[PDB]
Amino acid sequence: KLTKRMRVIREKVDATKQYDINEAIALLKELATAKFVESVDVAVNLGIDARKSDQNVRGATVLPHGTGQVRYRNDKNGIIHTTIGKVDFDADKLKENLEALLVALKKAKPTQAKGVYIKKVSISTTMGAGVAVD
Amino acid sequence: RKQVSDGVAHIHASFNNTIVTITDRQGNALGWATAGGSGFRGSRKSTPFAAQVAAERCADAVKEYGIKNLEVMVKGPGPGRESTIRALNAAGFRITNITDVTPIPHNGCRPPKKRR
Amino acid sequence: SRVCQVTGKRPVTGNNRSHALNATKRRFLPNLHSHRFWVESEKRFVTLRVSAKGMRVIDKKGIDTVLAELRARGEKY
Amino acid sequence: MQVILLDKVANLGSLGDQVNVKAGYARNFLVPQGKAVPATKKNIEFFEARRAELEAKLAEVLAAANARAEKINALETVTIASKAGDEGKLFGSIGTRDIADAVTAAGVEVAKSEVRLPNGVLRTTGEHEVSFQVHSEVFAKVIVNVVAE
RNA sequence: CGCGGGGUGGAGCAGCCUGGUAGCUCGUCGGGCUCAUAACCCGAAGGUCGUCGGUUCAAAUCCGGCCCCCGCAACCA
RNA sequence: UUGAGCCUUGAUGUGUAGGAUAGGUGGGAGGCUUUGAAGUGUGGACGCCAGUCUGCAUGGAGCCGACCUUGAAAUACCACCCUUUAAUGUUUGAUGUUCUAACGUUGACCCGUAAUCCGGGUUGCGGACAGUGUCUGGUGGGUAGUUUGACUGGGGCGGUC
RNA sequence: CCAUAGGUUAAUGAGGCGAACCGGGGGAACUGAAACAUCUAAGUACCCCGAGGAAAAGAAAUCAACCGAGAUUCCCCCAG
Numbered sequence: 179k180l181t182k183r184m185r186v187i188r189e190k191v192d193a194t195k196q197y198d199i200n201e202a203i204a205l206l207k208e209l210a211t212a213k214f215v216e217s218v219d220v221a222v223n224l225g226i227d228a229r230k231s232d233q234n235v236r237g238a239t240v241l242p243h244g245t246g247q248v249r250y251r252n253d254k255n256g257i258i259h260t261t262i263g264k265v266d267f268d269a270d271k272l273k274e275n276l277e278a279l280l281v282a283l284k285k286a287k288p289t290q291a292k293g294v295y296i297k298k299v300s301i302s303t304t305m306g307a308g309v310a311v312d
Numbered sequence: 313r314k315q316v317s318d319g320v321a322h323i324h325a326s327f328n329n330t331i332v333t334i335t336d337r338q339g340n341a342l343g344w345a346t347a348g349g350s351g352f353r354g355s356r357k358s359t360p361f362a363a364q365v366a367a368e369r370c371a372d373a374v375k376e377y378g379i380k381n382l383e384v385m386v387k388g389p390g391p392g393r394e395s396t397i398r399a400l401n402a403a404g405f406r407i408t409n410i411t412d413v414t415p416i417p418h419n420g421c422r423p424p425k426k427r428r
Numbered sequence: 429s430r431v432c433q434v435t436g437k438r439p440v441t442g443n444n445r446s447h448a449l450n451a452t453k454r455r456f457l458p459n460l461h462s463h464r465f466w467v468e469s470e471k472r473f474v475t476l477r478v479s480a481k482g483m484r485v486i487d488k489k490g491i492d493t494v495l496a497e498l499r500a501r502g503e504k505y
Numbered sequence: 506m507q508v509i510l511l512d513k514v515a516n517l518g519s520l521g522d523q524v525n526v527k528a529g530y531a532r533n534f535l536v537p538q539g540k541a542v543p544a545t546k547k548n549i550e551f552f553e554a555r556r557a558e559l560e561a562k563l564a565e566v567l568a569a570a571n572a573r574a575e576k577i578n579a580l581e582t583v584t585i586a587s588k589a590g591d592e593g594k595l596f597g598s599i600g601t602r603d604i605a606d607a608v609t610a611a612g613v614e615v616a617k618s619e620v621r622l623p624n625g626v627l628r629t630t631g632e633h634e635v636s637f638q639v640h641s642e643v644f645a646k647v648i649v650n651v652v653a654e
Numbered sequence: 655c656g657c658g659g660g661g662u663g664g665a666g667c668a669g670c671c672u673g674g675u676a677g678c679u680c681g682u683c684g685g686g687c688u689c690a691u692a693a694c695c696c697g698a699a700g701g702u703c704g705u706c707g708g709u710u711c712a713a714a715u716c717c718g719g720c721c722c723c724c725g726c727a728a729c730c731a
Numbered sequence: 732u733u734g735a736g737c738c739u740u741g742a743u744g745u746g747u748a749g750g751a752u753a754g755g756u757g758g759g760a761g762g763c764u765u766u767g768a769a770g771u772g773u774g775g776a777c778g779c780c781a782g783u784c785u786g787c788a789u790g791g792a793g794c795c796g797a798c799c800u801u802g803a804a805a806u807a808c809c810a811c812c813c814u815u816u817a818a819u820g821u822u823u824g825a826u827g828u829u830c831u832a833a834c835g836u837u838g839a840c841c842c843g844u845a846a847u848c849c850g851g852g853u854u855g856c857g858g859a860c861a862g863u864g865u866c867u868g869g870u871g872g873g874u875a876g877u878u879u880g881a882c883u884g885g886g887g888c889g890g891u892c
Numbered sequence: 893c894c895a896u897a898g899g900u901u902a903a904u905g906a907g908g909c910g911a912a913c914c915g916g917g918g919g920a921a922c923u924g925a926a927a928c929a930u931c932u933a934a935g936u937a938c939c940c941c942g943a944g945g946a947a948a949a950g951a952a953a954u955c956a957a958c959c960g961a962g963a964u965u966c967c968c969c970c971a972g
Contacts, residue, residue: 179741179806182766187809194739212761212808219758221811229717231708253756254709254716257811261758302810304758354694441918448730449930450876453919459864463833466537472896475850480864487506487532487543529859533833602854617854 183211191307202276202301202309203269209306210265216304217245217264218272221257222280223297228256232290239282243271265303276301276311316342319382321370321400325390330363332370332396334382342377345370347392363392364399371403381406385413432458433503434482434494465491474505506531507544509552512564514540515641520561521552571639578612581647589653593630599651600626604635608647615639627651 180188190208210216226233235258236251243263250260262279263272280296287295299311319342322333333344347362350369356362382405386393401407431438437458444454459480464473469492478486486494498505508531510518517524523544526535535541542548552560585607589595604627605617621638630651637645 181763181808183762184808185766209809214759214761216808217758219810221757223811227717231718234709251756253812255755255812257756259757259811298811300811302758304810305762305808306810308810356695438917451930452875457864461834461863470896483532487528529833534831537832 186211187305187307191309193307196310196312198312199273202311203272205309206272206301206303206306207265209303209309212305215264215266217261219259219302219304220262220276220279221259221300221302221308222283223299224252224256224258225293225295225297226252226256226288226291228252228254230290233288235283235286235288237282237286239279241275241278243267243275262301313376316377317380319377319379321382321384323384323386323393323396324388325363325386325393325396326388327390328358330366330390330392330396332363332366332400334370334374334379342379343370343374345373358391360392360395363390363396366392367396367399368403371400371405379405381408383408384410386410387413387415389414430457430460431477432460432479432482433476433498433505434478434485437479437482467491467495476505508535508541509544509549510535510541511552511556511560512540513641520564521557568640568642572643574613574615574637574639575643575645578608578645578647580612582649583607583611583647584650584652586652586654589630589651593653595628595630595651595653598626598628604649607649613637 187209191205206218224235226235228234234252234254238247238249240247241262245261245263248260248262250258252258260279262275276299280299283296300308301311302308316336319334319336322335324331324333329346329348331344331346333341335341345366345368347359347366348357350362350365352359352362352365384397384400384407386397397407397410429438437460439458440456442454442456444452446452460477461480462475462477463483464475465486466472467474474495495505506526506528507523508526509523510521512518513520514535517526518541531541531543536543542552585599585603587595587597587599587603601620601622602617604622605615605620608615615637619637619639621636622633623636624633627633630653633649633651635647635649637647639645
């Protein structure tokens, strides 16, 4: 299934390791090995009960750095997806952007939300692998 | 699957039924079909035509094993016995040899007296 | 007697409290079973009646160290 | 436990490791046969300092001692005569004791505990293969024949 | 009182779990059937999934309840 | 050998519209190729037998995103995962076989010793069973401690409280 | 084989008795609850083992309370 360029992407990010904060965005632009301007895919795991109606979360967040305000709606699988920025941004900028939307989840976390809420944090370049965050 | 090449067809053609069982050369069964399994209940069960479809439904259901050629060892009197080997040969199997293994005793036990 | 040679676990008495709390005098017996211990100094076997927890004291301490205590107390080993 | 080994052992040790084995395996097999010693620092320094270079290699010399036993029997074909009946059929099926008794006068002074005969305890009469397991590494085979005395 | 489930032509069981497309056997009729009665065989008539909402392109299904039918472990006010 | 949890890698999933054996969501429109290409020879894996996938290689260096009919977009690139499952690593459990050192031995023989007790020693047979302890379900009148109402034209029965 | 088990001799000490008290090991039921199973009676009766003139306990991994007290035992309060 794998080809040349993807093998290079795989040898930069090991899917068998959970990383810390400052390691994330540094290796983010190292994932995009294409010439055109790409974006970042934010996949955040929920601890909600997607099979139960009272916990299907949806909302928006006013981002001070843009990709403005981006909208997002969850799935019945339990993970919500949305983009938050692009590849060629500065390291400092997206640090506050990731901090921006997940604390917004602090706001939209249901009262019937059984279990630990924030499960797994992992952002990835549209042409890169998933960079996990604690 | 295991893909076997040669096998042997056991045809138990008795007075009421004609249960056909295709096994391998070692005796291990692969697939089987009966006259009473393909519908045909009652008087039509003890019929050579029912033995025909018994052979057809046993012709398949052994496709996953892919038997090229096989032998035939018929047993019992039965109304089929010779009409069932026809449908098994015309099905697409190579018949090498046909044998008869009807179990006749040498006055072993006292058969029933029934049927008045 | 049902007493462990090493430790000295003698049977104790207690109740057999039921669901309705009916107190019936029962008795707790140590886990005693004779075992043959290979002493390295004498290079032979010495049979002792020990409890299961008594065996663990033997393998954590020295088998000869245990026998030294029995020698100091008179229990014929 | 945490036992420190002396010999190699048939499956886990490499002559001087600290493998955590089952309590019974050490207390009933390893320790009484001198294959290993319990892991208590005093014994550990007795091993890693003293025996690490002394007793470790002299354990190798007895391995060469029965390497001597490999071919003490340049003959490797001893014949015993015991009473038998018609067409083979030994009356007194000789055991492991008697087979060792034959070689003590015609070769190795091997004892009972080393001879390993797979094909029964020798009831029949004819060509036989007797395997002497003098060590856990070397195997010595001896072809013997029994006579119908 | 909690942990699990099952609810389907008149009726016993399927399929659901892994979403879109409901099958099966008796009970009734047209006969065929034979100088006939009996047996047998073929064809046809009958539930839109217990019900109310959420989600989805789509709900019998996934999930929230109710009505319950139960399998129980319990059961020291 | 065989279940299960988990990790990684690689598969996996045809109402019907229809070039698509597409599950949801989804970011951006180039990946891709000569760290040896489209097409094809052939077997295997899968098979609602519709149409995928794929080791080596003659060949020889291309293949296609939006575009369009769809409720949806193209495993060209990618992330978190659902159902079905494949190898490995790893973790324990449940079975079958073999073995010997624990343990059993109310087998033989020798000794303590003129002793059918017992202990010890070679050896034979079983063998991680058996049996014993702690915990636990069941059974249990074998045994134990007890209850088994009052009124009542005497008590019982009936009736009542 | 060595060696232990065993055998023999000598030295030293022990055994039994005694009214209660004392420590430990085992341990009832009648009775009360107006019945009775938890509970009570009671760790009492009784049995057993051991020592002394007393015996047991005993110099804090104890309390207290953010101030302090200082091994154990017994008597009086605390307090029915």
